Amino acid sequence: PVLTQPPSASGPPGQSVSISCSGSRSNIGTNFVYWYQQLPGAAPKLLIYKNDQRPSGVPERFFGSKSGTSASLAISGLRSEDEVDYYCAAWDDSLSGHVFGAGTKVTVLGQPKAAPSVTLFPPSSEELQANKATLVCLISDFYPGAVTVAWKADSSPVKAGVETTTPSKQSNNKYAASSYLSLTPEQWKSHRSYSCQVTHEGSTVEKTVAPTE
Amino acid sequence: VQLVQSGAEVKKPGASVKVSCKASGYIFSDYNIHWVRQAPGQGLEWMGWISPDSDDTNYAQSFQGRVTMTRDTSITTVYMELSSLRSDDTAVYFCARSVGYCSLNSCQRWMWFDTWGQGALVTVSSASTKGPSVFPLAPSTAALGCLVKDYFPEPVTVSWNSGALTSGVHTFPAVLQSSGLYSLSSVVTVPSSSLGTQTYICNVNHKPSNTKVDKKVEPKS
Amino acid sequence: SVLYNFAPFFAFKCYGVSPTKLNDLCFTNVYADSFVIRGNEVSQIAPGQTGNIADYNYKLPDDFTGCVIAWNSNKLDSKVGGNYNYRYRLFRKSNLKPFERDISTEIYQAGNKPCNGVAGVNCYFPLQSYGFRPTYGVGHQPYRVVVLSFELLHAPATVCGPKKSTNLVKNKCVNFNFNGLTGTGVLTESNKKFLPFQ
């Protein structure tokens, strides 16, 4: 009886499109279905209550209705300021608790490709006195994300304590990625050339920085 | 209405935390208070309502002992206790205000969250309010940045030349480690011919640790 | 004596045995049902009278051996926001017979399509919350309604009225009445000795 919602939404501006929020048997239709939204970094609000009337304070753009198990959210025209995170809210009697959908992300169907830049910063001479060593190299000037970062010791790749994370959307409409590798002084001083590499449509950039600098 | 939230600290698993939402600004005998947790990567979760005049509650089949819901009519403030925080319990606890009494099971179909106010941010890790031990960085258009390591929890701020220079500083996501520590390295764009001729100092401030470090970055000698 | 207070009564005139004669007659069993209805639906419950809120809910027939007593009270009955606890059946399958009840959390159909998990335009909910708010009119106010029913000539009677007691008297013959023993004679101190069951 879990609510079924797509993780992402493909909404092209200029024309109407319908999105579905479905549950299961004796999950949708026996109880009213609500539409809820939340601003990123702010408290949520309500979009459509009971799928009957549009509440005051909200522009009449989202149309709420129920068709059996599937609940549809009909929209008319897409705006740049109406990109709030949409969610589906419903009540089920088999759980005695509200069940919420997976959440649909609306993205306007952008940015030209640019050459990536990778700069590596080795630790200074004071980290080896404390018996610690980490390697940080930044990846930027790439769009979109979902890039892969790897570490090369110029003899064989090493997969031990490699830290990678999902890139975040920059305020300048870009993507930036940071990679880390915390190692030991036995391994940090083992080789005289350490590099980190990334892939970008089949192209790679290798920056060779010696530990002794 | 005064729906503000009280601050809470990050606690390791093995204890309990207190999350409180202010209930003033409205009558406590007619308005219900609902709590919704928002966790990334999945849907929202909903665990029970309260009746702020007597003892009445209803639980769902997700949590039974981790969430204890209380009320206070003399001070008009509700207190919620969350025990054994984890990745499942790491969610934004939103304080929601809804009209209706609803001490039964057939009334929740007609309810809706009227107003959401000041959702608390709750986190959990073995890492305590420990302090950083960051050492200066040796660098090698060009780019220059300063790192921060073995610090917990988020967030931290970065300043270049005591905050007098702006170069489009953007925060970077970190990776959770086995012991538990964040990692941030803010990198600004610098000219290739300006690396040691112009001074470049980095300021890292840790608000939970209440310590300030100001270490310059220079190449090795 | 607790039936002549606790706010003035909206309807205390009875349709059977008088409410002032409850002491005069002993009953076997008394039946009371407690619920709150709107002020506009008080006139619906009556001997030989029904409407929309009365036919689809509990109905009071012409013969009841009892009547209804209702009063106005707003202490925990009306909410300034919402009141979803008190619901009324407005779309029922058929007529609701007296001394019967039905509860359903499932949607009620109104045509030929069987709605047993899917809804739409032709299918609605049989339940609806009451409009109990102090900002509304007098007829929208909630009223505490209780109905008293008496069962006679089927069992021994134990719900008797409160029979009062008087003071002591000595050495002066009156028309006494000792637990139903009516007689005339003096009241003197007895030198006899009884047994506790006598």
XYZ file of C-alpha atoms in Angstrom, chain B:
221
model
C 1.816 32.028 15.748
C 5.070 31.384 17.632
C 6.049 28.052 16.058
C 9.799 28.398 16.650
C 12.054 25.446 17.448
C 14.594 24.926 20.221
C 18.162 24.095 19.278
C 19.530 20.592 19.793
C 23.023 19.124 19.552
C 24.297 16.120 17.612
C 24.481 13.058 19.873
C 26.087 9.683 19.241
C 23.917 6.537 19.187
C 23.388 5.099 22.655
C 21.378 7.955 24.215
C 18.353 10.160 23.509
C 17.836 13.733 22.328
C 15.125 16.311 22.994
C 13.385 18.102 20.114
C 10.977 20.835 21.215
C 8.648 23.089 19.221
C 7.098 26.194 20.755
C 3.298 25.976 20.913
C 2.510 29.548 21.999
C 0.638 32.114 19.920
C -2.562 30.041 19.869
C -4.931 28.253 22.228
C -3.605 24.871 23.355
C -7.016 23.225 23.894
C -8.391 23.381 20.325
C -5.455 23.176 17.864
C -3.535 19.977 17.132
C 0.216 19.723 16.536
C 1.616 17.253 13.998
C 5.211 16.155 13.396
C 6.535 15.042 9.999
C 10.097 13.894 9.282
C 11.618 14.496 5.832
C 14.492 12.189 4.883
C 16.374 12.389 1.558
C 16.300 9.407 -0.768
C 12.824 8.264 0.314
C 9.355 9.520 1.159
C 8.178 11.404 4.215
C 7.296 9.551 7.415
C 4.450 10.142 9.865
C 4.324 8.574 13.313
C 1.402 9.926 15.358
C -0.640 12.926 16.408
C -1.203 14.441 19.852
C -4.318 15.626 21.679
C -3.175 18.637 23.734
C -5.786 18.377 26.490
C -5.535 14.744 27.699
C -3.765 11.443 26.971
C -4.631 10.225 23.467
C -2.317 8.976 20.726
C -2.147 6.575 17.786
C 0.977 4.879 16.439
C 1.863 3.583 12.984
C 3.801 0.424 12.128
C 7.167 2.158 11.714
C 8.321 3.196 15.210
C 7.132 1.995 18.616
C 9.642 3.010 21.297
C 12.031 5.447 19.636
C 9.434 8.251 19.453
C 7.828 9.425 22.701
C 5.234 12.192 22.364
C 4.434 14.415 25.356
C 2.507 17.617 26.027
C 2.369 20.444 28.567
C -0.626 22.749 29.001
C 0.757 24.881 31.850
C 3.657 26.280 29.791
C 2.128 25.601 26.316
C 5.181 23.762 24.969
C 5.477 20.244 23.538
C 8.602 18.123 24.019
C 9.561 15.174 21.809
C 12.257 12.632 22.682
C 14.099 10.697 19.965
C 16.327 7.788 20.990
C 18.927 5.762 19.048
C 19.463 8.107 16.122
C 20.675 6.513 12.890
C 20.533 6.977 9.119
C 16.833 6.063 9.143
C 16.151 8.577 11.930
C 18.295 11.283 10.291
C 15.487 13.497 8.995
C 14.196 17.058 9.233
C 11.620 17.004 12.043
C 8.996 19.502 10.874
C 6.647 21.147 13.382
C 3.211 21.353 11.745
C 0.053 23.033 13.044
C -3.360 21.678 12.040
C -6.908 22.489 13.118
C -9.224 19.798 14.440
C -9.214 17.665 17.573
C -9.206 14.145 16.024
C -8.937 11.784 18.976
C -10.416 9.001 16.796
C -9.372 7.112 13.659
C -12.005 8.299 11.149
C -11.187 12.013 11.569
C -7.677 12.057 10.057
C -9.124 11.735 6.538
C -10.494 15.294 6.791
C -7.335 16.834 8.283
C -4.618 18.723 6.427
C -1.469 20.488 7.610
C -2.447 24.165 7.710
C 0.926 25.667 8.661
C 4.449 24.260 8.969
C 6.773 26.140 11.291
C 10.540 25.949 11.898
C 11.455 22.364 11.109
C 14.299 21.249 13.356
C 17.481 19.784 11.869
C 18.518 16.621 13.712
C 21.709 14.674 13.150
C 23.627 11.877 14.855
C 27.183 10.566 15.008
C 29.825 9.209 17.358
C 31.871 12.258 16.433
C 31.403 14.725 19.265
C 32.014 18.446 19.539
C 35.655 17.540 19.012
C 37.990 20.223 17.733
C 39.936 20.407 14.475
C 43.696 19.921 14.153
C 44.151 21.454 10.706
C 47.705 22.067 9.441
C 48.644 24.556 6.685
C 48.433 23.462 3.054
C 51.152 23.632 0.400
C 49.811 24.340 -3.114
C 51.285 22.870 -6.278
C 44.539 29.766 -14.547
C 45.948 28.567 -11.229
C 43.950 27.670 -8.126
C 44.623 28.030 -4.400
C 42.620 26.542 -1.547
C 42.741 25.659 2.133
C 41.366 22.464 3.665
C 39.663 21.624 6.946
C 39.760 18.111 8.413
C 38.797 16.084 11.526
C 36.003 18.540 12.320
C 32.445 17.766 13.412
C 29.686 18.760 12.924
C 28.616 20.976 10.030
C 28.990 23.851 9.167
C 32.225 25.841 8.852
C 33.101 29.099 7.111
C 36.110 30.169 5.041
C 37.669 33.621 4.694
C 40.426 34.800 2.348
C 42.564 37.795 3.402
C 40.285 38.227 6.449
C 37.223 38.170 4.200
C 38.355 41.128 2.078
C 38.560 39.126 -1.183
C 35.635 37.460 -2.966
C 36.192 34.962 -5.783
C 32.889 33.080 -5.958
C 33.325 30.711 -3.022
C 31.078 27.645 -3.252
C 30.616 25.013 -0.563
C 31.454 21.400 -1.360
C 29.812 18.161 -0.188
C 31.749 15.831 2.096
C 31.954 12.058 2.564
C 31.013 10.302 5.797
C 33.948 8.283 7.134
C 34.183 5.181 9.317
C 35.162 7.138 12.432
C 32.952 10.043 11.349
C 34.306 13.386 10.149
C 33.529 15.892 7.417
C 35.954 17.260 4.828
C 35.769 20.663 3.131
C 38.325 22.372 0.868
C 37.188 25.735 -0.504
C 39.243 26.588 -3.602
C 39.363 30.073 -5.124
C 40.788 31.085 -8.490
C 44.165 32.846 -8.342
C 46.456 34.153 -11.115
C 49.392 31.984 -12.136
C 51.849 34.845 -11.527
C 50.318 35.773 -8.133
C 51.005 32.992 -5.627
C 53.562 34.369 -3.162
C 53.851 38.025 -4.147
C 50.327 38.711 -2.850
C 49.440 37.443 0.619
C 46.783 34.720 0.888
C 45.632 33.689 4.370
C 42.791 31.311 5.239
C 40.443 31.602 8.223
C 38.449 28.575 9.402
C 35.911 29.017 12.208
C 34.190 26.132 14.013
C 31.043 27.349 15.773
C 30.344 24.104 17.745
C 34.015 23.821 18.758
C 34.333 27.592 19.475
C 37.878 27.707 18.080
C 39.467 29.917 15.427
C 42.490 29.067 13.269
C 44.309 31.432 10.886
C 46.983 29.536 8.940
C 48.654 30.843 5.789
C 49.213 28.698 2.695
C 52.636 28.701 1.021
C 54.617 26.299 -1.187
C 57.186 23.971 0.345
C 60.720 25.166 1.064
